[PDB]
Design a protein around this ligand. Sequence first.
Ligand SMILES: [Zn+2]
Lengths: 67, 96, 630
Amino acid sequence: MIIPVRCFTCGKIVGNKWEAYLGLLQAEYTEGDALDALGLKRYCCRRMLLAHVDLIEKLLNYAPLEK
Amino acid sequence: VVSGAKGSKINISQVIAVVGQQNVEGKRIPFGFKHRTLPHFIKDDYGPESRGFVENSYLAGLTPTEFFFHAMGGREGLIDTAVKTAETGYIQRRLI
Amino acid sequence: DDEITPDLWQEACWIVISSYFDEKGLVRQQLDSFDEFIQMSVQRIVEDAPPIDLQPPRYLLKFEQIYLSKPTHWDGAPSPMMPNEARLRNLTYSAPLYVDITKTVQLQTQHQKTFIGKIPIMLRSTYCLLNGLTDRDLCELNECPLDPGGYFIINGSEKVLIAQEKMATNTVYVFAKKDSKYAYTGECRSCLENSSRPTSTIWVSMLARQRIVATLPYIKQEVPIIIVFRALGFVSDRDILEHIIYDFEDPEMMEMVKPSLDEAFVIQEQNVALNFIGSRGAKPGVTKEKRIKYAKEVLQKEMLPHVGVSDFCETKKAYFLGYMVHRLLLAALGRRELDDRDHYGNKRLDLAGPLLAFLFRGMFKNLLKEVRIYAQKFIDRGKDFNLELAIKTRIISDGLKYSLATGNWGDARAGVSQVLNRLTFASTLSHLRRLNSPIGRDGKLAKPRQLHNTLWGMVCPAETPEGHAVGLVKNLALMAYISVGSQPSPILEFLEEWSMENLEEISPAAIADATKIFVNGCWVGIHKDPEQLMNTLRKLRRQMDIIVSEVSMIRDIREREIRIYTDAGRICRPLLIVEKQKLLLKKRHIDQLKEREYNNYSWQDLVASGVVEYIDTLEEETVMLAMTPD
DNA sequence: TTATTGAGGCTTAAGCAGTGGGTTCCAGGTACT
RNA sequence: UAACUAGGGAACCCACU
DNA sequence: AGTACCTAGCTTAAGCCTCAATAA
Ligand SMILES: [Zn+2]
């Protein structure tokens, strides 16, 4: 639902790179250039960001049961 | 293959060279439509690609007509497997 | 210059597919079928029910207008019920059904908008509370915007109606029975649509040896066909053979109708034939006139109800019976190939609409029956009875709820309604697009389980169970659409306006050269110029005229017939239209579809431009189809 | 000549591989107070 | 001054080998 | 009101029907 903290394969930190990836994508970068700008060199770290779906933003559209 | 662990020469030939002729009940792909196997062919077409000869390999990729005819063959295999188990169980019980 | 070049074709075709799925989605068959059920079929069933009458002071009751509220929950004040609340509280997502009853005894009173029962509402249909809501509004109701709907909530359980596959009605099929007493057998599951009595199947068979025999509904023993023809009011041999054989220069059919006439030499009068066919009924007649009246009732109602059920229609019924015998003869001559049972043009898919309509017919008949019971109990004392006390909403509400919950259909067959699979989203979509063949799963017949040729583009060739239900449980292809059903009337007025001569206004000598025209399987007349007629019918269908886009128009060319199909259950798919080796789809259509959310150009505008059209399986026989524009 | 006792053609049960999980259902109807 | 068990049937559906 | 209670297809063995030698 949310970006994993680490790449599953190697363990590089990718949890701090999802918002920066989205900011680079709206800055008209290609996905490959955005991955290269974040330092994700191994393709194991690259498909953590390339293939991620952020379900948490859809989960946040529902009001919490307590408030 | 040559260790005998898995596969056959037919599997290698199907992967590399050609898949071959798709069969339903021992014959070629029948005229399920009116004298056509599919609406993409002319009527009374008895050629290879019209009646279920897959000329491509698995690596090359099946054309959509070849894909459908291969699906027909695989469906026949699944039907045979299911009715085979269902019929052989009773023969086993009667024999024992 | 406006053509899509081959390097633009992949982008163009996927924009077309994206427009289709943006307009339609994936569960149009369920939602459209249920919407048609609620909008038309409920009112048709209520009005089609006979005006009930009790008798002495004699009064009658009539139901005239159907009102449906939004889904509502009640002891206290009624409040709107969201589907999530019905899911949580184990309630049934249902809407109240209101009718207004007139009571004429004479004194006429209006019981306006009386409550007769609760109808479960399929989610995201036009009568559901989530209809037309935005994604934000769906999320405010704790509903998933990606949820497709198409299911019912029955006691908090999500229920999906699996589409039931059946033989198509009102169509003549000739098969061969292996090693039976009949060599070739004809068959017509005749059913008058929008009334939908228990369907009547007639067999016109020929004995193996070569006499032609007719198997009639509600007659135990087999009946010679010439006796049936003389019982229709044709006491001759020129009349019967003119109804059967349209071409006197073919003597082989004359040879094959020798033995039926020879065996029917005993009877040459109409009432003798009525007595002969009524002596073998389900209820045997006490006397001769009872037998004659019973056989007349059978010929008027049970025998071929789709070609006509009232009186004074014996000539159309005799024409269709002669057509059945002619098809049987052509099959025995070999001039016509034997019909394929696994051909999906010969099959219909009973969706949520027709299944709920069958249930509603049974339950409305029941509700009327205890209205008779209550009124008969209270009329013996001479006192007036309240309609609110007479109406039993319990039986219709609980019967419909019970059949949607357990899946047992009728007051017969099971597994029609199933709990919706919610393991993953793909399983939900697959369960919502499931087709079921009701062939018994213990049989070893591989032919209904085999992947037939006619499933191209209609049914997925890969998605099937690998267990005992292999080849029987099927899954709908992505752009495959099931026809929702429509009235054949405007096509009939257009046909009689377009120089088509009716059956009762022609001599039988003109049948041989002209083209027979069938509308929903009913022979309505002949046309002497079938090519320009089919061009005109196609031009009307492409232009979104009085012929709607889901109407199937098939011209058999080798044997002169034009079949127009309008009923529900026909599985169809959109195809691009090719004229003079060129796609009618141009670059301007793709350019307009690119800004789909800007200029409001949609898939419907692409259909209305005559660019794409829906071709079902029977029409796909006559289609010369290109896989790619290459 | 003629019944009489023998042998060829029609309906109808009795069958039809195994292991888990889930869902629904196993009752209203007037009296009477 | 530890008082110690489990529960029915009939149908359907799905999955698995 | 609460409720007593009285009520689709297969194959095959087995049982059941009409026509021909044969003595009375
Ligand atoms: Zn990594």
